[PDB]
């Protein structure tokens, strides 16, 4: 009956996160929307409790984080299999993510980036495969289209 | 140019269902007031003309009417003896266990997925139907958005 009940972007992101975790083995998932020129934290699932305040308060600025600027410019996914030693991250982020393989998937609708989904698992596990990534990219693209219809209001 | 379309979502749903829940076949329909064939996977050759040309009318098939009213998935382990089917479907499906799953967005039925196994194999379990519900709900919402705002 009211538009608010039909445009609930957070329930879309919750459902997306749950389904991804059920389909692909992951330590955690962190979803951001593209605002202010930067990515704002939307929802995480599986982060260690101590890192939840960090996630909730830390915007991600492409101008500070080369990986993110690349993802945004190319409108394509990127994976870091050794973030600890990557110049494409901030010193802060290299340390935070040092034990992790990180897949960065932009939320793209037509030609535009509206957000990003980051998925992580520990580096002693195999990196995300092409097969896993194909599923992820599909599901994120579905969610992005839905969210974009909703954010029109 | 969009990163997906209704056809690609249905192919994706079909692939994931087939991967995660072993079936003989699946058949997906859109709800129009009857169900129109969308795509099948795994049907024998001889029945592809039947699938392509047999709309399913709830007014004629009580099982489908129940599915549509209740917004519930329904399983028949013995279609041959079932009063909730037509003579045609009783014969067609006599050797199978069939799960009927509605494609629902906020109470609205937009389609259905039928999944079959042979009667000789284990029927679908509650664990299997939970997986199915999750996948079908996702597809339903995306498809409904596309049908409404993009097509």
From TrEMBL, chain A:
Transmembrane segments: none annotated. This is Sensor cyclic diguanylate phosphodiesterase, GAF and GAF domain-containing. It comes from Geobacter sulfurreducens (strain ATCC 51573 / DSM 12127 / PCA). The chain holds residues 13 to 167 of 550 of the full protein.
């Amino acid at each position: 009956e009211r538009l608010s009940g039909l445009t609930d972007v957070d329930e879309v992101i919750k459902d997306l996160s749950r389904l991804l975790r059920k389909l692909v083995k992951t330590r955690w998932i962190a979803v951001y929307f593209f605002d202010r020129r930067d990515f704002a934290p939307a929802r995480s699932t599986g982060l260690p409790a101590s890192f939840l305040p960090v996630f909730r308060e830390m915007p991600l600025a492409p101008d500070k984080i080369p990986l993110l600027k690349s993802m945004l410019r190319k409108r394509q996914h990127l994976m870091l299999t050794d973030p600890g030693s990557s110049d494409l991250l901030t010193p802060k982020l290299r340390k935070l993510l040092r034990n992790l393989c990180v897949l960065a998937v932009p939320m793209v609708v037509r030609t535009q980036v509206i957000g990003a989904v980051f998925m992580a698992r520990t580096r002693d596990n195999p990196p995300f495969s092409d097969a896993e990534t194909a599923i992820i990219r599909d599901l994120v693209s579905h969610a992005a289209l839905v969210v974009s219809h909703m954010q029109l209001f």
